[PDB]
From a paper:
In response to the N-formyl peptides from microbes and mitochondria, FPRs play crucial roles in host defense and inflammation. Although FPR1 and FPR2 share 69% sequence identity, these two receptors display distinct ligand-binding preferences. In contrast, FPR2 is promiscuous in ligand binding with recognition to a vast array of ligands with diverse sizes, structures and functions, ranging from small molecules and lipids to peptides and proteins, which enable its involvement in chronic inflammatory diseases such as AD, systemic amyloidosis, and atherosclerosis. In this work, we determined the cryo-electron microscopy (cryo-EM) structures of FPR2 bound to Gi and four peptide agonists with diverse sequences and lengths, including Aβ42, fHN, and two formyl peptides, N-formyl–MLFII (fM5, derivative of bacteria-derived formyl peptide) and N-formyl–MYFINILTL (fM9, mitochondria-derived formyl peptide).
Numbering used by the authors:
A (entry chain A): 6 to 56, 184 to 355
B (entry chain B): 3 to 340
C (entry chain L): 1 to 7
D (entry chain C): 6 to 62
E (entry chain R): 19 to 317
The structure:
């Protein structure tokens, strides 16, 4: 019958068209940004701004990246965080200078501690068991100026250490890594935000490249 | 006057419970011992719909009961033809983060909300070319959990901002705003007469709203977790709500009570979809155990398992004539059960 | 690949 | 200022919701059985339908 | 001798267990990946390898009963033609698919950007057809030279015959020798040297790169890689070495019969190669945890 044949060929055209549109969407790296309390998400997007949720798509070294910021979503996270199950990596932003700052909503909650709770809820999240996290420590330029004036022991009492920029940054970097519980299956790549060009951009490409190797080897049976 | 208001709030809430307690004589399950169990409704997958390349979050059945729309996280909206297993239309989305979809009862328009705060309306015919965006509703500050078409011009959408809004397609303006939910609204269902609708939020509370007046007729609170699904009884005088604790509760509008609880010891995972049969006897609920369980609306006995989905069942719908039931899941497949 | 005898 | 106004709305809604009439559950639930039994034959899911009648074979 | 009798009986049971395990594993892999799993590039490669191995093992019992009764063929000419075409095509396709899987893994590891942006299913089948057409091209002489030959004693052998090609016995013998030597060289180079060099290089760079990146979190990846490469080498190098020695000494064998140990040793080498064809899904498909969870969910 002619009527069914026209419908049948239309479905084949739709089926064919879905192949290219699904191939151009599966060849782009999917990223996701978190961090509440002005952690530096807006600053982070600026470096890789080549081209409720914001899609800042960009391409670096002939590889396309898809970036999704969910900072405008003030609702419950558990009802939509499962939609991102399958992203290549998670770009988490933490402010180094936020150890002594306090949330605007509550005057008794530490900003750094709140970020740790958000980080803990992501590492232990059931939807990101095998999803790596690209940790970014923002505002390192202002952190070294503030760490000398304000001791870091106010945030973590159980820390003697030394009042130095390198010592304080390393301890914060280590503290986030030890907060992870799903070891041996995910890697928390960590970097410090730098005003120099193509510095943070290169780290994102380098971190994603390692994850792609992990994803490729996992699907190949080597992992 | 916080102390006085707290006492005033408590006494009314106690009055609601005290009035309900006097009104309650016996459970529906007790007075249904006599009715014949329906039996073992063994439903089979007559048609399998494939072609999506991501997790499927919502689906809707049209009045024709032949064309259904499915929303998937790949950024494509597909108008399926269940009779012949054909994709009538492929609607691309500006934002791939879609979690709800709707189909107009007359079949002229479709909607799809999500994390983008946009309820895009698409014209099915578009005689001038292919499917194109007709209107973009942008007045919500949260993810559009569920949207349903009321008429060809009026549509009601539930968002994550704990508010529900009724929209006009031509003007693109919120006709009225429904507020009162403490938690984020997750789903809504429309009565056959479209005069009333209920919304299930994350505060374990279900509220009945009036379309024309914007007033909340009733509030039901019988759950203890998120309410991810809701669906009116076919007569429109009752509805059933899903929950995250594997408990379906049937609420009657006239009774203003939780009639009965559809829970089992074996099932522990959450419920994301709730649907009713043509006669309302078979309460189909979509669970997270990778299968759909068909319940008895009067006997509290499971009457079959639709174990044909690889991933968690996220959407579930029943045709208006009840001819077939379509189940969608995160495994990027639709199973038509009949 | 498969070896074949010769008479 | 704002807290008392928002809280008063909940009390007004509670009083407003308490003014409706509660139909007795004994006969409200009885109507559910009547509708189910009336449309049981018409419902294709409750009673199996031969593949000839349905379009999904 | 007693040792020779055991050395002849053992290949029979080796091929029997190869048949059983290969059919079981290939059927399971096809049922899981081809129907209950999403269609991906690695899934397509695994499906092709499993299909080739299943087609080979389903053909194996003919070779088993041939080796049981002293290489005699009781079946017909068309059936032996089909059985040896299927055997040769399946062997060549399995080796070429192993090489292609190694190349794809090497490309994915060394250049992840190209793999992410230039690995599509359509291109996957387009480039997998290449090994198959190469197998057909290499098998063309096996298509059109092979035919069943009956000896005057009344026993039948399906081997190569050159009476039609050569008008006189001398030129027929000369063309037979030259074609057999050419086939041996092609087998050793394309069938063995090309993939063995590819497999060692492709897997060598994969291990080398992950070591430099500090990707070694467990011994499982190294164990799997070394097991695959070692098994492939120890099962294919002896058989191809025996074939090469037979081809380079074919003239002496057919003119003087100087060497006889090669003819005896062909059978164990063929058994080992067939056992590799059996175990390829085990070391290529069941290694992944996704396949295992899908399989256990399937039952």
């Amino acid at each position: 019958s002619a009527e069914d044949k026209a419908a049948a060929e239309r479905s084949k055209m739709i089926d064919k068209n879905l192949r290219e549109d699904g191939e151009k969407a599966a060849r782009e790296v999917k990223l996701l940004l978190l961090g509440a309390g002005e952690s530096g998400k807006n600053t982070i997007v600026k470096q890789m701004k080549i081209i409720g949720i914001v899609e800042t798509h960009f391409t670096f070294k002939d590889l396309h990246f898809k970036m999704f910021d969910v900072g405008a979503q003030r609702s419950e996270r558990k009802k939509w965080i499962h939609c991102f199950e399958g992203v290549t990596a998670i770009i988490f932003c933490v402010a180094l200078s936020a150890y002594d700052l306090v949330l605007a909503e509550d005057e008794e909650m530490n900003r750094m501690h709140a970020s740790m709770k958000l980080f803990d809820s992501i590492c232990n999240n059931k939807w990101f068991t095998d999803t790596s996290i690209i940790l970014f420590l923002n505002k390192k330029d202002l952190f070294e100026e503030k760490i000398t004036h304000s001791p870091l022991t106010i945030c973590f009492p159980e820390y003697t250490g030394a009042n130095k920029y390198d010592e304080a940054a390393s301890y914060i970097q280590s503290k986030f890594e030890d907060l992870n519980k799903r070891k041996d299956t995910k890697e928390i790549y960590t970097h410090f935000t730098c005003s120099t060009d193509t510095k943070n951009v290169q780290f994102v490409f380098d971190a994603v490249t390692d994850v792609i190797i992990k994803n490729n080897l996992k699907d190949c049976g080597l992992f | 006057e916080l102390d006085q208001l707290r006492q005033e709030a408590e006494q009314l809430k106690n009055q609601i419970r005290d009035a309900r307690k006097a009104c309650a004589d016996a459970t529906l399950s007790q007075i249904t011992n006599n009715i014949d169990p329906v039996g073992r409704i063994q439903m089979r997958t007559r048609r399998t719909l494939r072609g999506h390349l991501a997790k499927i979050y919502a689906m809707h059945w049209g009045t024709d009961s032949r064309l259904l729309v499915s929303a998937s996280q790949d950024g494509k909206l597909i108008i399926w033809d269940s009779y012949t297993t054909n994709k009538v239309h492929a609607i691309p989305l500006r934002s791939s983060w879609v979690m709800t979809c709707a189909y107009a009862p007359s079949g002229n328009y479709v909607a799809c909300g999500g994390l983008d705060n946009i309820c895009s309306i698409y014209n099915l015919k578009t005689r001038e070319g292919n499917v194109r965006v007709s209107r973009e509703l942008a007045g919500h500050t949260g993810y559009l959990s569920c949207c349903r078409f009321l008429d060809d011009n009026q549509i009601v959408t539930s968002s994550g901002d704990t508010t529900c809004a009724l929209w006009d397609i031509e003007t693109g303006q919120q006709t009225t705003t429904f507020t009162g939910h403490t938690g984020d609204v997750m789903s809504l269902s429309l009565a056959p007469d479209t005069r009333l609708f209920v919304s299930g939020a994350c505060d374990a509370s279900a509220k009945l709203w009036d379309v024309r007046e914007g007033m909340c007729r009733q509030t039901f609170t019988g759950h203890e977790s998120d309410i991810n699904a809701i669906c009116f009884f076919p007569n429109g005088n009752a509805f059933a709500t899903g929950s995250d604790d594997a408990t379906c509760r049937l609420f009657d509008l006239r009774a203003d009570q939780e009639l009965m609880t559809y829970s089992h010891d074996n099932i522990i995972c959450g419920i994301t979809s709730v649907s009713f049969s043509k006669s309302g006897r078979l309460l189909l609920a979509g669970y997270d155990d990778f299968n759909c369980n068909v319940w008895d609306a009067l006997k509290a006995d499971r009457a079959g398992v639709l174990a044909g989905h690889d991933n968690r069942v996220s959407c579930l719908g029943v045709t208006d004539d009840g001819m077939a039931v379509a189940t969608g899941s995160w495994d990027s497949f639709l199973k038509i059960w009949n | 690949m498969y070896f074949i005898n010769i008479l | 200022t704002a807290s008392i106004a928002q809280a008063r709305k909940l009390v007004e809604q509670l009083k407003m919701e308490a003014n409706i009439d509660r139909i007795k559950v004994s006969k409200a639930a009885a109507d559910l059985m009547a509708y189910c039994e009336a449309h049981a034959k018409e419902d294709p899911l409750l009673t199996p339908v031969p593949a000839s009648e349905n379009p999904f074979r | 001798s007693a040792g020779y009798t055991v050395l002849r009986i053992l290949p029979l049971v080796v091929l029997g267990v190869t048949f059983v395990l290969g059919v079981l594993g290939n059927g399971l892999v096809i049922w899981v990946a081809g129907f209950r799993m999403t269609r991906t590039v690695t899934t397509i490669c695994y499906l092709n390898l499993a299909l080739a191995d299943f087609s080979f093992t389903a053909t194996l019992p003919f070779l088993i009963v041939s080796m049981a009764m002293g290489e005699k063929w009781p079946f017909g000419w068309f059936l032996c033609k089909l059985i040896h075409i299927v055997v040769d095509i399946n062997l060549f396709g399995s080796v070429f698919l192993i090489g292609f899987i190694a190349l794809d893994r090497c490309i994915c590891v060394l250049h992840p950007v190209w793999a992410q942006n230039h690995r599509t299913v359509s291109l996957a089948m387009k480039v997998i057809v290449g090994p198959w057409i190469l197998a057909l091209v290499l098998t063309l002489p096996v298509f059109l030279f092979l035919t069943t030959v009956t000896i005057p004693n009344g026993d039948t052998y399906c081997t190569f015959n050159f009476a039609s090609w050569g008008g006189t016995p001398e030129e027929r013998l000369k063309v037979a020798i030259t074609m057999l030597t050419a086939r041996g060289i092609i087998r050793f180079v394309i069938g063995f040297l090309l993939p063995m060099s590819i497999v060692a290089i492709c897997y060598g760079l994969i291990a080398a790169k992950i070591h430099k990146k500090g990707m070694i979190k467990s011994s499982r990846p190294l164990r799997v890689l070394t097991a695959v490469v070692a098994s492939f080498f120890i099962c294919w190098f002896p058989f191809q070495l025996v074939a090469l020695l037979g081809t380079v000494w074919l003239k002496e064998m057919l003119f003087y019969g100087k060497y006889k140990i090669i003819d005896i040793l062909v059978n164990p080498t063929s058994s080992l190669a067939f056992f590799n064809s059996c175990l390829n899904p085990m070391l290529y498909v069941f290694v992944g945890q996704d396949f295992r969870e899908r399989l256990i969910h399937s039952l």
